[PDB]
């Protein structure tokens, strides 16, 4: 993630999470196999964006952190997917 | 997709997903046959937009990654359809 | 479709799929006879727009590819309706 | 329609279908008597719009997609209604 | 209506149908007695406007053109009501 | 009503029917005793708006023009109430 | 109300009825004891507003003008409440 | 309230009633013990704005002026809370 | 609260209660243990806004002022949470 | 959070809680295990924004401050994730 804040400047690239929505909710023998779709929209200092969508899922999560960490992995998967789409080296 | 970044500038073309919708969900013998339609937008450096619409489907997906890669691959095929429709070589 | 990119410049005309809506869904003998209507508004550089409506239909599509095909054919019909509606030769 | 492109310029008038709605749906002995109401808004190069309301109908069309052409005829008769209301010869 | 196009410039007055609503629906011995209220706003070239509303009703219409000409007569009656409301001779 | 067009210029004052709302509906022995509240807003050439509310009610109307003249009379009495509020003599 | 037109100019003080809501409806021995709440904002020529809220109620109204004079009296008393709020003598 | 009109100018301080919400309704032995919340803002001639909420409650109000106190006393106490919040002496 | 007006200018800060919401309603033998969530946004004269979220609760309140607790507990808690977040001494 | 006020100026960064929503509510042996997601958006003086989401959970909270603590500490965890994502040292 810091590689992005390294290719662009400390005030070069921005983030605006459009929508983060739940896909399903499971209760099978206490397992919570749930996923989420997140759409972040980066904005370089040149006013060029790269909106995309990423997914984040968790399988068992008995303690009920299934809604805890799914959000962060989904959001960071989308940040990685934006770099995959463009700005691979610049 | 990288060819689009090659033909345009590194800050020449953009992407604005505005409509990701899942149409049907199946439960047949555990298999999930689901589809998704994605509509994106592009603010080109010259301010021209080749909006379009793409579709992606998955047949069995026993582990339920059906809702996982449907969105990503629908978005990528719709971005490909954007090149297919307009900007054939430029 | 490429003739539109030819009679105009590579950045001459635009496209904005305003509304794609499906009308019905059939299951008679496992056949899916479904049709959708789509509205688009191409935009010339001068700013003139041409809004239309286009309908795309499929008859049997037993393995349910209808949703995949309906959008593409509706968009193609919509664009042809634009071409006949205006800018026939310029 | 081409006569309108003749009196005006190739980039003189516009078109905007913003309200296309379906009043009823009949299945009398398989026949589909359905109608639709469409509202267009043409815009001259001088900026003087002209918005009216046009209606179309179909009587039998035992083919299930009787919705295929209703929109087209409603829109064209609504454009004809715009021609009738104003700009009769210019 | 052509008298309005005569007193005003061909590009002098404009028109936009704000709302077109259906009051009721009757099925008495197959006869349809239905009415609509239409609100249009006209706009002179000087920027002044004259909003008003009009009503159009049909009694029997056994063929069911009851929804066919109700809208046209409502819009016509309401433009006439605008003419009587203001711009009587200029 | 014409006195308003006389004290102001033909292009001095305007009118904007903001909202017409039907309070109730009656069916007693076929008689329709119904009313409506119309809120119009006028605008002088000096940009001084005068918004108000008026009401028109019918008592019997066996033929059912009860929804026909209620709206027009309500709009008229509200336009009159606007003059009662301000612009009495100017 | 005319005193407000006297203290200010003929085009100095404006009115904008923003929210008229009736809270309840009674049918007790046919008598209608109903109330209405009206919120309007006035505007001086100096671009200073003075928003408030007033209430108009009626008790018996056997003829059912209960919905007739409620709005008029609510708007009147709310304008009076604006006068009490500010512009007491100017 | 007049002290506010004294500390600032006659056209220096404004009022914008934003949200009046009725909390509940009581019918106990005909007594109406009801409360209301009013959110208003004031605007100073310098462009600064103070926004707050105020609550008004009534216990018995056998005659049912309970809704009458909503329009007056809740707004009054919220306006007082605005002065409490700021501009205590200037 | 007055200390914030003291470090700031008399017209330097602003308050905007964005959202006051009820969380729950409890009726325990007359007790009302309810809490409310208030999000307010402040704005300094330098155009530097600062949003946050505050909470205010009441335990027994047999007299039912449990709804009025707001602007006296919850909103002032948000005013204090904003002060804690930033502008600790300036 | 004060460290952010140290690296940036007293009027350098901002905060805007765009959406806080509670995920679930548990009533197990009186204990409440609830979670909340908050989306804040910091804004630097240079018009650069870190939009992000964070989560806050509470397990037992028998007294029911569960809806009280989560709102504050989830927003705090998410403002911390702001620094975790960007502006590591500046």
Residue numbers in the entry:
A (entry chain B), B (entry chain C), C (entry chain D), D (entry chain E), E (entry chain F), F (entry chain G), ...: 1 to 90
Task: Copy out sentences from the published article reporting this entry, exactly as the authors wrote them.
Homologous recombination (HR) is an essential double-stranded DNA break repair pathway. In HR, Rad52 facilitates the formation of Rad51 nucleoprotein filaments on RPA-coated ssDNA. In S. cerevisiae, Rad52 is an important pro-HR mediator and Δrad52 strains are defective in various recombination processes including Rad51-dependent allelic recombination and Rad51-independent single-strand annealing. The primary DNA binding activity and the oligomerization regions are harbored in the N-terminal half.
